[PDB]
Structure 1
């Protein structure tokens, strides 16, 4: 069975809108989401429908761009580092579960390269 998705709403959690988080939504997330390789990463892994009974035995910190998108749109984060960590968790999970040269890994690698290019221009906090 699938676990509940990562949290995207939590009223008592401290949270902010910073200019860096706005950049992560308007530039970084937007760039990755439109890419031809984004689709596997646009929602949590459905281990039931993909017939992956081992996925959530192996991946204990799941993350995906649908969750990140909801977090950014709901202003769930305190800082940019927390969101950057979510992206890095997503990529790392893909590399942990899959094998070098798999199609999904080639896709994650292309998205990660673009991610790195965009976060190099993360603005100074205003």
Structure 2
């Protein structure tokens, strides 16, 4: 089968900013999740071919992963923190949509999401 192109991480005509909230999303939020023992399945787009999941991109139409988020943050792709927060939430939601309750991958997403919520609870006010 075939994978779709990954989400874009570069777009020169999309307005961009570097804000203190976005810096926090990279330095604290992404870094915290990335190093977690359960991060690995989320560090790159789902390879539906290698995983033999031909229905994945039939069901998931807005794919997202932390590899993409990391690149977006490092390359200042975002205008605001809410855009990036939405990407994280999309990543988690996709996992819950595609998989079954209790599946290992769902337990992994839940652990990462718990940490995500802990960190964004202390998102700094905009400077």
TM (norm. structure 1) is 1.00
Cα deviation, 1:99-118, whole Å, max 9, x if unaligned, reads 00000000000000000000
CA distance in 1, matches of 2:73, 2:80: 11
Cα deviation, 1:69-121, whole Å, max 9, x if unaligned, reads 00000000000000000000000000000000000000000000000000000
CA distance in 2, matches of 1:71, 1:64: 11
Cα deviation, 1:7-59, whole Å, max 9, x if unaligned, reads 10000000100000000000000000000000000000000100000000000
CA distance in 2, matches of 1:82, 1:76: 10
Q: Which runs of 4+ in 1 moved over 3 A?
A: none
What runs of 5+ residues in structure 2 fail to find an aligned partner?
none
Count of residue pairs the alignment pairs up: 126
TM (norm. structure 2) is 0.99
Residue 123 in structure 1 maps to residue 124 in structure 2: yes
